[PDB]
């Protein structure tokens, strides 16, 4: 039953930096915690085949330490999970942090003590920590999502969730079904297709995907990037999404059918999902006609790629190109293989799982040895809403988030003092690490200020939280995503966080 200045929940990008900042800049005694048996967070857990970043390799990392940027290396233009995981372990060892982290250790309640003005925090190892500050780096993701299919437990084969992939497991020569065609699904599908005896993909909503263009690089290309890194990060910190391309301000309809498609083809060829949505035109997300053009281009690629038309149509993405854009390493092409079958489960849904496989409503048994669920997770809400987290006067987090989850500035919420969030709700939608730094940096300032000036407790007003929900909402419904995040872009997000701090923490009850 110990007592410290600060607790950090989680050891991915966000939890790792927060420890570094709170211990080494602000001198605070600081303990880190993670269920996981080591660091990496998202990348400790997802070791499924083909797991790859959407963010180019040079930019999906910390920026804050200039020696590190010069010494780290990568193989391709996008970075794989082993390589990311490895990088976070180098980072963890480089800044001397293993020793602040209790691994294999779940934080299971967070009681705020109104009279001691402290947070009482308990582990599944029995321990208790009493801390003045809590920093939640629990991520945008929550519990694995895992639809309970009828008869599932009759299945005599192995079932695997993408995020619980057994290290070392091979599906080579097995008959495998995959459910889900999200970002994970496309990846695990491209990578499985060539090795398995047969692949059945259960598609519910086919999505829009552009080539990822993941190319090999030589040490000289890296060294041209290394030489220009102050400008790269300054540029990225001053863009909206920080994916490393200039963001277009050219309206789609402001140029010609041929020009429009010329631009859409160079982007296709160059590769990159965000690059397609935002590197090409500036209104794809905000003008109806801009959007339809982008979407149409992609469907023509799909009909150019899938030879058999009954298959093509099952994989044909429909309607607004207003989900997060995917990119792949040859996804549509997989459906030309004789040992891949597509099952459109809107038209022909799963009726049940039986001993030997999956049965659809048409009454065909799809014989499977392995059923892989690429069905994702259950939202930000989920990693908080699954705990004894209570704020002032014992108020429960799930009681406090009576409806949609909320925050002020993506890092805080009313009735939860000295309690912060890294990637809480209504935060930025960007290449995450640069946003994680913004958040951790602001959180570490705020906490340095609190100690230096003798602040007992800080928390936002419910007035302010609601003003933020409105700002996020007004900006959302100006885009085609409407038809959970602040969508004004990193640069605006940074000026806002900075103004609030320069303005004496406006929207915050300081005690």
Give residues in contact with ligand O=C1CCCCCO1 (CB under 6 A): 54, 429, 432
Strands 107-113 and 388-390: parallel
Q: Is the distance from CB of 418 to CB of 133 less than 8 angstroms?
A: yes
What is the spatial distance between Cα 86 and Cα 81, in angstroms, rounded to a whole number?
8
What is the spatial distance between Cα 309 and Cα 314, in angstroms, rounded to a whole number?
9
Give the Cβ contact number of residue 343 at 10 Å: 21
Q: Is the distance from CB of 366 to CB of 200 less than 8 angstroms?
A: yes
Interface segment toward ligand FAD; rule CB under 6 A; list 42-50, 203-211, 486-494, 498-506: 42-50
119 forms part of the interface with ligand FAD (CB under 6 A) = no
473 labelled ligand-binding? no
Out of 431, 444, 446, 469, the only residue in the binding site for ligand FAD (CB under 6 A) is 431
What is the spatial distance between Cα 268 and Cα 150, in angstroms, rounded to a whole number?
41
- Gaps after which residues in the chain, C–N over 2.5 Å? 483
Q: Output the residue with the shortest Cβ distance to ligand NAP.
A: 182
Interface segment toward ligand FAD; rule CB under 6 A; list 51-59, 111-119, 462-470, 488-496: 51-59
| Whole-Å CA distances, 142 to 161, 378, 382, 384, 427 | 14, 5, 5, 8, 16
45 labelled ligand-binding? yes
147 binds, among ligand O=C1CCCCCO1, ligand FAD, ligand NAP, none (CB under 5 to 8 A by kind): ligand NAP
14 binds, among ligand O=C1CCCCCO1, ligand NAP, ligand FAD, none (CB under 5 to 8 A by kind): ligand FAD
Out of 130, 204, 270, 385, the only residue in the binding site for ligand NAP (CB under 6 A) is 204
185 binds, among ligand NAP, ligand FAD, ligand O=C1CCCCCO1, none (CB under 5 to 8 A by kind): ligand NAP
34 labelled ligand-binding? yes
42 labelled ligand-binding? yes
Numbers of helices and strands, H then E, in the chain:
17, 24
Strands 340-344 and 350-354: unpaired
Out of 36, 52, 263, 371, the only residue in the binding site for ligand NAP (CB under 6 A) is 52
Q: At its nearest, how many Å lie between ligand NAP and the CB of residue 278? A: 15
DSSP class of residue 256?
Answer: -
280 labelled ligand-binding? no
Binding positions for FAD: 14, 34, 42-43, 45, 54-55, 60, 107, 324, 432
Would you tell me which residues interact with ligand NAP (CB under 6 A)? 52-54, 147, 162, 179-185, 204-205, 324, 374-377
């Amino acid at each position: 039953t110990h007592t410290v200045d600060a607790v950090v929940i989680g050891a991915g990008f966000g939890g790792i930096y927060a420890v570094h900042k709170l211990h080494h800049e602000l001198g605070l005694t600081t303990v880190g915690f993670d269920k996981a048996d080591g660091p990496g967070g998202t990348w400790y857990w997802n070791r499924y085949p083909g797991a790859l970043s959407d963010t180019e390799s040079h930019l999906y990392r910390f920026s804050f330490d200039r020696d590190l940027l010069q010494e780290s290396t990568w193989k391709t233009t996008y970075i794989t999970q082993p390589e990311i995981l490895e990088y976070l372990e180098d980072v963890v060892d480089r800044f001397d942090l293993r020793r602040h982290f209790k691994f294999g250790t779940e934080v299971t309640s967070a009681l705020y003590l109104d009279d001691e003005n402290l947070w009482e925090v308990t582990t599944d190892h029995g321990e208790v920590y009493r801390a003045k500050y809590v920093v939640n780096a629990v991520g945008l993701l929550s519990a694995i999502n895992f639809p309970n299919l009828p008869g599932l437990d009759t299945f005599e084969g192995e079932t695997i969730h993408t995020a619980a992939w057994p290290e070392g497991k091979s599906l080579a020569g097995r008959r495998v079904g995959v459910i889900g065609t999200g970002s994970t699904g496309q990846q695990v599908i491209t990578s499985l297709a060539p090795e398995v005896e047969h692949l059945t993909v259960f598609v519910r909503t086919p999505q829009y995907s552009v080539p990822v263009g993941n190319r090999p690089v030589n040490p000289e290309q890296i060294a041209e990037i290394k030489a220009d890194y102050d400008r790269i990060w300054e540029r990225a910190k001053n863009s909206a999404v920080a994916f490393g391309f200039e963001e277009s301000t050219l309206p789609a309809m402001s140029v010609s059918e041929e020009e429009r498609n010329r631009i859409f083809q160079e982007a296709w060829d160059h590769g990159g999902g965000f690059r397609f949505m935002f590197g090409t035109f500036g209104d794809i997300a905000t003008d109806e006609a801009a959007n339809e053009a982008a979407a149409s281009f992609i469907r023509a690629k799909v009909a150019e790629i899938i030879e058999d038309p009954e298959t093509a149509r099952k994989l044909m993405p429909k309607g607004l190109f207003a989900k997060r854009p995917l990119c792949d390493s040859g996804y549509y092409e997989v459906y030309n293989r004789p040992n891949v079958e597509a099952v459109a489960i809107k038209e022909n849904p799963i009726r049940e799982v039986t001993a030997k496989g999956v049965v659809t409503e048409d009454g065909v048994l799809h014989e499977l040895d392995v059923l892989v669920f690429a069905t994702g997770f259950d939202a930000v809400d989920g990693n908080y809403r699954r705990i004894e987290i209570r704020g002032r006067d014992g108020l429960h987090i799930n009681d406090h988030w009576d409806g949609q989850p909320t925050s002020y500035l993506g890092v805080s919420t009313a009735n939860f003092p000295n309690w912060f969030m890294v990637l809480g709700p209504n935060g930025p939608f960007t290449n995450l690490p640069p946003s994680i730094e913004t958040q951790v940096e602001w959180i570490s300032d705020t906490i340095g200020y609190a100690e230096r000036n003798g602040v007992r407790a800080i928390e936002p007003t419910p007035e302010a939280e609601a003003e933020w929900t409105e700002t996020c909402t007004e900006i959302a419904n100006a885009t085609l995503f409407t038809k959970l995040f602040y969508l004004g872009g990193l640069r605006n997000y940074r000026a806002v966080m900075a103004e609030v701090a320069a303005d004496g923490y406006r929207g915050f009850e300081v005690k």
